[PDB]
Amino acid sequence: LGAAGSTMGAASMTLTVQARQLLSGIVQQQNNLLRATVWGIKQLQARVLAVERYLRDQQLLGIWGCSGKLICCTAVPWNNSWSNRSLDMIWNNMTWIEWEREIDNYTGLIYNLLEESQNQQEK
Amino acid sequence: LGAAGSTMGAASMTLTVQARQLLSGIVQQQNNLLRATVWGIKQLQARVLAVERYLRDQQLLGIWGCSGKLICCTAVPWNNSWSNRSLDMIWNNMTWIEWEREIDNYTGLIYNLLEESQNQQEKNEQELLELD
Amino acid sequence: LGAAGSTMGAASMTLTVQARQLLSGIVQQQNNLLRALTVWGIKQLQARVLAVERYLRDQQLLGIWGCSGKLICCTAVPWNNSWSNRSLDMIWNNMTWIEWEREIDNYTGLIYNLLEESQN
Amino acid sequence: WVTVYYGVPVWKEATTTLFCASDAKAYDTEVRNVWATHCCVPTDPNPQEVVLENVTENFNMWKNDMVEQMHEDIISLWDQSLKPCVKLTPLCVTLNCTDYERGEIKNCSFNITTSIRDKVQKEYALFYKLDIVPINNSYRLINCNTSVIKQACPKVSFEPIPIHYCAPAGFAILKCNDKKFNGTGPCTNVSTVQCTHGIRPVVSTQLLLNGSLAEKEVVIRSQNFTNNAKVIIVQLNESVVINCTRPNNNTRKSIHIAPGRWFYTTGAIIGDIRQAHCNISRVKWNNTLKQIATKLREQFKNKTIAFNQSSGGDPEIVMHSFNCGGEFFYCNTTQLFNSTWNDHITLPCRIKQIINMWQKVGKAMYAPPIRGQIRCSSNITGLLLTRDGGSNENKTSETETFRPAGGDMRDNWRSELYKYKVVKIEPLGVAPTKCK
Amino acid sequence: WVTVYYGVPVWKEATTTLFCASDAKAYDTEVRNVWATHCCVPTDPNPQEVVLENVTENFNMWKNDMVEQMHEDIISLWDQSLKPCVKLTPLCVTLNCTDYERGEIKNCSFNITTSIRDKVQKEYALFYKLDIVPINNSYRLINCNTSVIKQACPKVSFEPIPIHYCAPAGFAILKCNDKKFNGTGPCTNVSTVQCTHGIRPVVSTQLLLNGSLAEKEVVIRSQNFTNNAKVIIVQLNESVVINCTRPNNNTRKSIHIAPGRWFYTTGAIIGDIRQAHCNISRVKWNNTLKQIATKLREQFKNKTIAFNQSSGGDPEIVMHSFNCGGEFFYCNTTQLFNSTWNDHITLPCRIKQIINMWQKVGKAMYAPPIRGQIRCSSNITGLLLTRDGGSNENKTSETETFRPAGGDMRDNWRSELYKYKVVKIEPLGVAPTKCK
Amino acid sequence: CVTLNCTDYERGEIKNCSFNITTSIRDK
């Protein structure tokens, strides 16, 4: 689960394998069953939130029409107002961390546009 | 959020995009608002209930083969003893609420038939087709 | 959870029903609706959280195998007779299906990832 | 080829919470009975049950975890209920007693904890001899030297109601719905139920009260007849009715001992004083003896069967401990278990108020007195018996002897929960085929 | 065009609930460690570490939330542990104390009224001077006037054990492996781990005990070296070995304070009375200060450095206050830090039994005797120091004077835990491409 | 919750009461 400093191209190549490990379960197999009053309530809160995060990612991808897939090509065009950089430099000079920070303030917008454009697919 | 004073036909013309707002509301946004045994255990219980309800609906769409679908058509015929009305009365005179109430008594029958056929008889047929 | 045919439902007759899969992730909702004191309350809440977690773990595994949308899923993995075998008629006409657990839990326990990683 | 299926009807042993149940009886002022705190919706009328054809399962009742769960549920509920009630340690002071049925009732004078307002006051209360220990007529409460005695809250009922146990999602209860099941092994008419039948959480040492009845005839169900250190749990056919009375007309006093702490005690007895007793009448339990005769061959070969006396010396074990009302009876069962067979009667009863429940040494409960004239009746449904272990003899006895025995409260419930086993469902699995 | 990628290796800063981990020692000696909640998971055998090439991260030890979490966790555990133990309020009665180095240990007699019989029982015990306050030479226990004193429970050990912190699933811990990291800033050679190294939750006020060592040199870290109000954490690259003992051959007495509880005090002392002294090798200590002064000269103006003694009159600040076995030692360190750098050691100690642990005022903890001759040893791995600074005088000093410092007890953890940072993984994002 | 001896200070709207303290610390 390394190559964090690698470029987006390098890190996304074979994203799927890396993703299977990340997505083997949030807790993998229920903390690989290794872990199977206040301490108790704090842990229930932690476990519930882990479940919500899992489901939220799956739900959002499903809304966008990306299910059973890790990489999805959508109906929303890139707006240069979000970022106006050469396609090549973001993919081979920038890392994913740098990229996510670069467009962090457009996250809500892009996601909202994806839900509207992906929902409007006849269905 | 919706209307529901409209007839089934009119209301459903936008189901493609009304849906995926109701769905979104179940998991997204509220959980950002909430990032803060009176108002303790109760909130934890509320979160758990929302998850349980969500999964129930997704599981049924899955068992009936409507995976990722908002509108899905299957092989189970309508039994005319249920709401023995014309198609137009059902779709253009009645609203969704009125409709669900009229056939509330047949929900179990409909769901059992959907499970027996879709993805059940249908998947035994697929195992046979994939034998070659 | 009627389990009709749980024992000797041929094996193949069990598979014409598969109707008990709608209970573990659903009946809990009904139980909570009927209910709608930490001495019992925390333990009961833990039980609810666990039931959800177990459900999801099985769904995640079916997802990795490429079986999440199916109740019956044929994968591209040959059965390995060195673990266990008998004729298919015995397998399909007389269900127990526990003789396979030690070996399969490792064979398919590993293959689910190998299969998908090397699928194409 | 490997095919994976997700609705496979298989299961494994598992443990969990069993929710709770009640009959949703109105609380009827007072308080909700402690058992009525089990605020679970009553099992729907006509509970679901499905018979599973061809199912064989091993219902080893001696390893049944539901017994342990019921045990924990009772201990826990009682402690939570007594926890916030009045402490009686201010009453451990020396008392001056004047001895007023052979001195069973004493009139004892308090010198210290006599007034809430500051005063050198004197005060009196009546006590039963069993709770008073000698230290001229200088006495203290029996458990003060080691324990903290609390008064049960006068408003709280601990009276049993039937309670059903239910399975959480992902679990099922397998019922051994068969005839003459001996407690272990197969019973091949297994049904799955959503919940158990109701069982009243009654605790009564030697004679089990208000249980289910044997079907057809009496069964023995021991764990191992050749193991001398084992209990035999006998379920009786039909039933025996027992009538218990404490024929005394009391009054109540309320003494303010510490701020907000009131001690509820007995004031005076109106009319004559009489010994408590229980009536059993001409019971011929010869069919139990015949079941013993069937198992007699294992139990030292064919021998004369005797039940001549209750022993061990400890009243908690020796006498029948019976909960009639808010008061506890200790009855001498020697008049029932006296006869021997080849192959109205009364039990005098004593009354006790300080109960060392479940031998939780260091703590005890005080039972405040009832208003007066208590009479109750109950059904005898089973017995906890032990057999005298074999002696180091030359194999000369022609008789075997059994005695009322018990004290381990879990054996009171093994007798009802024997039909149930808890398993979890594992719907995911694979099988070989010939496809893609 | 927008393409959605899931499984993307990106993290953001986060604060979360942390998990414990510990060795499965399973001592099972009928003594539980207080660290009984430390076994939520066994220590992972063969833990992994993955170096992230070309990742630069900012670490801030002064704002580290794992340090804050450790504090909350230790306080919570202590309160849970002491909560059910016997209250010592029956002992707040007036004491009559006489002597048993003069006046260090006193023999106090008293009238205790909670004896079960509710009549006065005369009792006596030996106490150390630090726990007794004057109030005609009558005395009372030092904290009775303001708080509830509870006895630590027998069969609970408070021995520090290594504890590893682990990320919750969905989170990761980044570790700083850069050399001479120092603080508040970028770190290269960042690696990802699941669990931290073990940290022993050892509590002290001046000299840090049983910690990790610096790999190459003595390292001095501070949030601000010009702000004279900040604590300087000094990590050593070699441990100085310290021995300490309390030789009095104490024999324990037990007082029946409550029905279910016993109070433990020293009854008598056999043999001669001696001070509970500590022993530090002179050479290693002197060389350690030499190295610290050298590094301070590089950090500060390259001028003369002096180390002075403790300031203030508060025992938890001025003395070492470490926990050895079951005793609390308050050692005089003014013997140390008495030199100027321009280019065996015996420490007397006192024993105190009533501890205002964590500076809480609701309650105080009482430490029972441990039967004499207590010996322990430990490693000095670092110091908590402050620079004195001073008023704005007209260049009246060419020497920077430093003193031992203490309080807060957060630097006890920060000094080792600083290498770790918590982040959350959010593997979802988008990027431009050529698409539909 | 002990006996008070009240002397007052509409008349006795406000009661001036002499109080014996259940001792909080010293048991004297």
Ligand SMILES: *[C@@H]1O[C@H](CO)[C@@H](O[C@@H]2O[C@H](CO)[C@@H](O[C@@H]3O[C@H](CO[C@H]4O[C@H](CO[C@H]5O[C@H](CO)[C@@H](O)[C@H](O)[C@@H]5O)[C@@H](O)[C@H](O[C@H]5O[C@H](CO)[C@@H](O)[C@H](O)[C@@H]5O)[C@@H]4O)[C@@H](O)[C@H](O[C@H]4O[C@H](CO)[C@@H](O)[C@H](O)[C@@H]4O)[C@@H]3O)[C@H](O)[C@H]2NC(C)=O)[C@H](O)[C@H]1NC(C)=O
């Ligand atoms: C402990 O105390 C209990 C009381 O709490 C006491 O119980 C009695 O026990 C005796 C002996 O077993 C019973 O006697 C038998 O009665 C059989 C007939 O039962 C029916 O008729 C009863 C009387 O009817 C009158 O009253 C009714 C009132 O409503 C009226 O209509 C009628 O017209 C008539 O006037 C009736 O009470 C009984 O009711 C049942 O249901 C109620 C429901 O609420 C319940 O409360 C009752 O307890 C009872 O279950 C029913 O309708 C009779 O056939 C039988 O005789 C045959 O068998 C004997 C076996 O020995 C043979 O010898 C004989 O030759 C016959 O073949 C016998 O007479 C009596 O009914 C019980 N109940 C009462 C109230 O008295 C226990 O014995 C005490 N135990 C000890 C150890 O002390």
Ligand SMILES: *[C@@H]1O[C@H](CO)[C@@H](O[C@@H]2O[C@H](CO)[C@@H](O[C@@H]3O[C@H](CO[C@H]4O[C@H](CO[C@H]5O[C@H](CO)[C@@H](O)[C@H](O)[C@@H]5O)[C@@H](O)[C@H](O[C@H]5O[C@H](CO)[C@@H](O)[C@H](O)[C@@H]5O)[C@@H]4O)[C@@H](O)[C@H](O[C@H]4O[C@H](CO)[C@@H](O)[C@H](O)[C@@H]4O)[C@@H]3O)[C@H](O)[C@H]2NC(C)=O)[C@H](O)[C@H]1NC(C)=O
């Ligand atoms: C506080 O208390 C501690 C004790 O709790 C006390 O510790 C002593 O400290 C001194 C000074 O640091 C140590 O002395 C040094 O020892 C070096 C050799 O150490 C090894 O060999 C020891 C010898 O015994 C072995 O061999 C013999 C002969 O065959 C055999 O009979 C023995 O049974 C044994 O096998 C051995 O004891 C020692 O093991 C201890 O220490 C290790 C490491 O901490 C620990 O893991 C063990 O469990 C055990 O406790 C180890 O194996 C020696 O090289 C060194 O020499 C220096 O000086 C010479 C010049 O004289 C130079 O030429 C040389 O290069 C070095 O610079 C020195 O002699 C002593 O060993 C410690 N004692 C113990 C028991 O640990 C502290 O001093 C006390 N402090 C104060 C202030 O009082």
Ligand SMILES: *[C@@H]1O[C@H](CO)[C@@H](O[C@@H]2O[C@H](CO)[C@@H](O[C@@H]3O[C@H](CO)[C@@H](O)[C@H](O)[C@@H]3O)[C@H](O)[C@H]2NC(C)=O)[C@H](O)[C@H]1NC(C)=O
């Ligand atoms: C003070 O610091 C010193 C130096 O780090 C500590 O010494 C170390 O103690 C451990 C435990 O006894 C030694 O580990 C053992 O080594 C033997 C081989 O000799 C091996 O067989 C054992 O399984 C185990 O791994 C370690 O080697 C030793 N370090 C050195 C350099 O000698 C000392 O314990 C510390 N004191 C305190 C109180 O923590």
Ligand SMILES: *[C@@H]1O[C@H](CO)[C@@H](O[C@@H]2O[C@H](CO)[C@@H](O)[C@H](O)[C@H]2NC(C)=O)[C@H](O)[C@H]1NC(C)=O
């Ligand atoms: C076991 O269950 C089966 C039904 O699943 C019962 O019914 C018979 O099953 C056999 C084996 O498949 C068939 O050949 C018969 O034709 C079935 N009977 C009928 C009337 O159709 C079977 O009786 C059950 N066995 C036991 C011991 O309970």
Ligand SMILES: *[C@@H]1O[C@H](CO)[C@@H](O[C@@H]2O[C@H](CO)[C@@H](O)[C@H](O)[C@H]2NC(C)=O)[C@H](O)[C@H]1NC(C)=O
């Ligand atoms: C003792 O057993 C009797 C007989 O079984 C119980 O009384 C009746 O039980 C039958 C079922 O066998 C019911 O149909 C009747 O309605 C019951 N009658 C009454 C008055 O309850 C009786 O309740 C049991 N317990 C006691 C204390 O008598």
Ligand SMILES: *[C@@H]1O[C@H](CO)[C@@H](O)[C@H](O)[C@H]1NC(C)=O
């Ligand atoms: C006990 O009560 C009797 C009542 O007759 C009285 O005479 C006697 O003095 C009392 N004893 C004490 C110790 O109070």
Ligand SMILES: *[C@@H]1O[C@H](CO)[C@@H](O)[C@H](O)[C@H]1NC(C)=O
């Ligand atoms: C005990 O006897 C005395 C007379 O000696 C009487 O005044 C008192 O009321 C009696 N107490 C009780 C509880 O009956």
Ligand SMILES: *[C@@H]1O[C@H](CO)[C@@H](O)[C@H](O)[C@H]1NC(C)=O
């Ligand atoms: C005290 O009681 C004993 C019997 O336990 C009796 O023998 C003795 O004489 C009594 N003493 C007095 C003074 O009444």
Ligand SMILES: *[C@@H]1O[C@H](CO)[C@@H](O)[C@H](O)[C@H]1NC(C)=O
């Ligand atoms: C199995 O149980 C059902 C339900 O009680 C009963 O009707 C049936 O007769 C039983 N079958 C056998 C073989 O005992």
Ligand SMILES: *[C@@H]1O[C@H](CO)[C@@H](O)[C@H](O)[C@H]1NC(C)=O
């Ligand atoms: C019961 O039998 C034993 C011998 O086994 C004998 O010692 C005892 O006295 C008898 N008790 C009664 C009440 O008959």
Ligand SMILES: *[C@@H]1O[C@H](CO)[C@@H](O)[C@H](O)[C@H]1NC(C)=O
């Ligand atoms: C990336 O790593 C190389 C090789 O160690 C190093 O020379 C370079 O300076 C690093 N760049 C950054 C931004 O860390």
Ligand SMILES: *[C@@H]1O[C@H](CO)[C@@H](O)[C@H](O)[C@H]1NC(C)=O
């Ligand atoms: C305190 O103890 C001494 C003996 O050591 C005794 O002489 C003195 O009277 C006692 N004082 C009080 C107030 O009890």
Ligand SMILES: *[C@@H]1O[C@H](CO)[C@@H](O)[C@H](O)[C@H]1NC(C)=O
């Ligand atoms: C009484 O007070 C004087 C003056 O402080 C002191 O010397 C004397 O020792 C005191 N008495 C006792 C018993 O300590």
Ligand SMILES: *[C@@H]1O[C@H](CO)[C@@H](O)[C@H](O)[C@H]1NC(C)=O
């Ligand atoms: C980075 O950390 C690893 C930890 O195993 C170490 O082996 C490696 O030498 C370190 N590299 C640098 C440049 O510090």
Ligand SMILES: *[C@@H]1O[C@H](CO)[C@@H](O)[C@H](O)[C@H]1NC(C)=O
């Ligand atoms: C600690 O640092 C000093 C100064 O650089 C050095 O002389 C000494 O050898 C180092 N100690 C160890 C154990 O490496």
Ligand SMILES: *[C@@H]1O[C@H](CO)[C@@H](O)[C@H](O)[C@H]1NC(C)=O
């Ligand atoms: C403490 O003084 C008392 C007298 O009040 C004496 O009996 C006791 O033995 C003394 N304690 C010790 C340990 O000498």
